[PDB]
Amino acid sequence: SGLVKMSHPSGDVEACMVQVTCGSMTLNGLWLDNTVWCPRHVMCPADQLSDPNYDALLISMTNHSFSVQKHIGAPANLRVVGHAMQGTLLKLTVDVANPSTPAYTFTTVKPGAAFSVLACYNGRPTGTFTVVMRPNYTIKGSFLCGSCGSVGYTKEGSVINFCYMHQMELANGTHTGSAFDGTMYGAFMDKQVHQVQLTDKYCSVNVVAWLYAAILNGCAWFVKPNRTSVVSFNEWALANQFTEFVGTQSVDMLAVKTGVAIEQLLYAIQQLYTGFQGKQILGSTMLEDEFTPEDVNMQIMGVV
Amino acid sequence: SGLVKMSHPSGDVEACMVQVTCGSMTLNGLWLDNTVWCPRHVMCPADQLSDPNYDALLISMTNHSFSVQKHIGAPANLRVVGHAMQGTLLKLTVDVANPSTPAYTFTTVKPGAAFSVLACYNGRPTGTFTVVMRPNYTIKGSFLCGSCGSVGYTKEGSVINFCYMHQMELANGTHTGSAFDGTMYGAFMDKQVHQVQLTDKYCSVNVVAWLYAAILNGCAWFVKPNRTSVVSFNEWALANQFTEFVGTQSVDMLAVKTGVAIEQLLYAIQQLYTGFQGKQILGSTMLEDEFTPEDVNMQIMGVV
Ligand SMILES: *C(=N)[C@H](C[C@@H]1CCNC1=O)NC(=O)[C@@H]1C[C@@H](C(F)(F)F)CN1C(=O)[C@@H](NC(=O)OC)C(C)(C)C
Numbered sequence: 001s002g003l004v005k006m007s008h009p010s011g012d013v014e015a016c017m018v019q020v021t022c023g024s025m026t027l028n029g030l031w032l033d034n035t036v037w038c039p040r041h042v043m044c045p046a047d048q049l050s051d052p053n054y055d056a057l058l059i060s061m062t063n064h065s066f067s068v069q070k071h072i073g074a075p076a077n078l079r080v081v082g083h084a085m086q087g088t089l090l091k092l093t094v095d096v097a098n099p100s101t102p103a104y105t106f107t108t109v110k111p112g113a114a115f116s117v118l119a120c121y122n123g124r125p126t127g128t129f130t131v132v133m134r135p136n137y138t139i140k141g142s143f144l145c146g147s148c149g150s151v152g153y154t155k156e157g158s159v160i161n162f163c164y165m166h167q168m169e170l171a172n173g174t175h176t177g178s179a180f181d182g183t184m185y186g187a188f189m190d191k192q193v194h195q196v197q198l199t200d201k202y203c204s205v206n207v208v209a210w211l212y213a214a215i216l217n218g219c220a221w222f223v224k225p226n227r228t229s230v231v232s233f234n235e236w237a238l239a240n241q242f243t244e245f246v247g248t249q250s251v252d253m254l255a256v257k258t259g260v261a262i263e264q265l266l267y268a269i270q271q272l273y274t275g276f277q278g279k280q281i282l283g284s285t286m287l288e289d290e291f292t293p294e295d296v297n298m299q300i301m302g303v304v
Numbered sequence: 305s306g307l308v309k310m311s312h313p314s315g316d317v318e319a320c321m322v323q324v325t326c327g328s329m330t331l332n333g334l335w336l337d338n339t340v341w342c343p344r345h346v347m348c349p350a351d352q353l354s355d356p357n358y359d360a361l362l363i364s365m366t367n368h369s370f371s372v373q374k375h376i377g378a379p380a381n382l383r384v385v386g387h388a389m390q391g392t393l394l395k396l397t398v399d400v401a402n403p404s405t406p407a408y409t410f411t412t413v414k415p416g417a418a419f420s421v422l423a424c425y426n427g428r429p430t431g432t433f434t435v436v437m438r439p440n441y442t443i444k445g446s447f448l449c450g451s452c453g454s455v456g457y458t459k460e461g462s463v464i465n466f467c468y469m470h471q472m473e474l475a476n477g478t479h480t481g482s483a484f485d486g487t488m489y490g491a492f493m494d495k496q497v498h499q500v501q502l503t504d505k506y507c508s509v510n511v512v513a514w515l516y517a518a519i520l521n522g523c524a525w526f527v528k529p530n531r532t533s534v535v536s537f538n539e540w541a542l543a544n545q546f547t548e549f550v551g552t553q554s555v556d557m558l559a560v561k562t563g564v565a566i567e568q569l570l571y572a573i574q575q576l577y578t579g580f581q582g583k584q585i586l587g588s589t590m591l592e593d594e595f596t597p598e599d600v601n602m603q604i605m606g607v608v
């Protein structure tokens with residue numbers, strides 16, 4: 001038992017991290033098969049970051065403008081034999097296929113979904129943590145200068161689903177990056193100009209999963225017979241900075257195991273959102289929305 | 305910027321995990337050089353777990369009573385050529401030295417200290433998270449059947465300091481394990497009998513580090529000129545379920561960078577411990593004590 005902020009083991013992804021350098025700029029890249037992905041702003045001089053012309057930067061480069069080095073594990077310098085831009089990312093083709101390429105897919109995550117991040121500097125992993133894609137299409141990470149190209153991913157069995165490449169910090173503790181189609185989460189621009197963000201909201205479905213996790217760990221003081229329908233809750237949520245609730249099979253399994261209906265926990269949220277009044281749930285005095293239904297099913301019941 | 309629950313990259317330790325089987329019992333072990341460490345209760349039949357005689361169990365075993373298998377990465381079956389007991393752990397000598405043994409030390413952590421845990425089942429890593437050794441010598445983990453032998457560790461540079469091998473769950477979400485001298489944290493017995501725990505307390509020095517992290521991320525509404533001396537705070541702490549505060553160089557660096565004295569934050573704790581009254585600090589409505597001064601210095605300032 002117990003519910004914690006859990007990340008995937010990072011070793012499989014550590015074996016794919018490289019350092020990418022373009023002139024005076026350096027960051028991290030992801031080496032899969034014969035391709036190295038990295039943020040395109042590695043091509044931009046500091047003095048042009050406020051108004052880059054990435055199309056012009058790209059044509060000013062040759063294959064030799066990029067240097068790709070693997071430091072950790074099996075060391076190596078990889079020769080770039082091709083270069084292309086896709087959205088906010090570069091795709092560098094290298095002459096050697098990564099012998100440690102895992103089974104992988106590329107996916108784009110949705111608000112409320114959780115993924116593991118491997119934070120790296122100079123091609124060297126330094127930490128791992130789990131984030132939730134916020135309703136305003138940012139993440140609340142921990143990233144310093146040089147962290148771009150750090151990757152986020154989920155895992156289904158042995159398959160790694162890469163979903164995030166770190167790009168920028170929009171405000172204190174507020175970050176965004178690209179999916180591997182090159183689209184920036186939240187459509188923010190990789191240019192150094194202030195860009196307003198939407199207000200953050202509570203992820204209602206994750207709050208429900210966490211309340212179920214509480215029931216499963218012996219904490220149910222907030223469960224009453226009262227119920228609020230999904231439709232009624234969703235009108236309320238839009239007026240109170242909560243996301244609209246969408247049920248899933250994963251949530252249904254928790255309702256079955258506990259015998260507590262989703263609608264009872266929606267009612268509870270409407271009472272608890274103003275404060276627990278000295279009471280606590282799983283050691284917290286506020287609603288927690290960083291645990292997904294899938295995370296709860298996995299940690300508490302072993303079920304995937 | 306940003307402060308999150310961060311763990312070390314786990315790849316170096318993943319390469320050291322094995323499965324250890326003794327009869328009908330199986331769990332994880334740690335393979336370093338020619339030694340495999342694992343919990344001694346792998347020798348105990350389920351029907352004797354409430355009153356084991358580990359000295360008698362050990363003499364009833366031969367080297368062949370243990371089977372050690374590595375599943376992930378470089379697979380292998382390791383032949384046991386020696387077996388010994390140290391405290392609550394077994395030390396099995398195997399015929400092959402782990403070619404991926406990192407530089408390592410063994411250390412015993414203190415309340416308030418944080419470490420990374422690699423949770424494993426059947427010799428296969430499944431997740432990683434960071435815990436703090438609680439003042440009552442438990443950890444708040446996430447562990448299911450089969451998780452014993454999962455390891456906790458810190459890292460100083462490239463050196464891994466192993467400090468924890470998972471042994472048991474004492475209550476919901478409440479865990480303990482061994483240091484690698486074989487001593488159980490909190491002196492709990494590896495026998496299946498209820499064992500009372502001391503009450504948990506807030507780790508005051510980590511609360512101070514987190515308040516400094518708040519100041520560094522633009523949040524200082526709780527800072528006032530008022531001060532409380534360490535001596536005065538420590539008498540108060542013993543009456544209010546807080547640990548006694550011990551300053552360190554790591555804390556002093558945060559006081560210097562922010563210009564806010566430790567004694568100002570000790571006063572703040574005495575006002576905030578009853579509730580923030582609708583206000584928030586780093587997105588929380590309660591004091592947080594899972595971030596150490598070292599963690600804060602590292603994540604926010606890059607400094608080790
Ligand atoms: C990649 N190494 C960094 C990561 C950034 C550094 C501080 N904390 C982080 O997460 N990425 C950048 O520096 C980008 C690159 C430039 C651009 F995005 F291409 F324009 C500027 N970057 C920013 O992150 C800026 N943020 C911003 O302009 O938001 C509108 C700041 C943080 C001002 C450099």
Ligand SMILES: *C(=N)[C@H](C[C@@H]1CCNC1=O)NC(=O)[C@@H]1C[C@@H](C(F)(F)F)CN1C(=O)[C@@H](NC(=O)OC)C(C)(C)C
Nearest residue numbers: 345447448449450451452471472473474494495496497
């Ligand atoms: C190792 N695989 C497990 C881990 C345990 C399982 C449930 N969640 C966990 O963290 N360890 C055990 O099952 C130990 C082994 C026995 C003994 F410690 F050697 F006696 C019993 N174990 C327990 O954890 C028991 N806890 C206990 O008796 O506390 C006093 C329970 C959880 C009742 C099996």
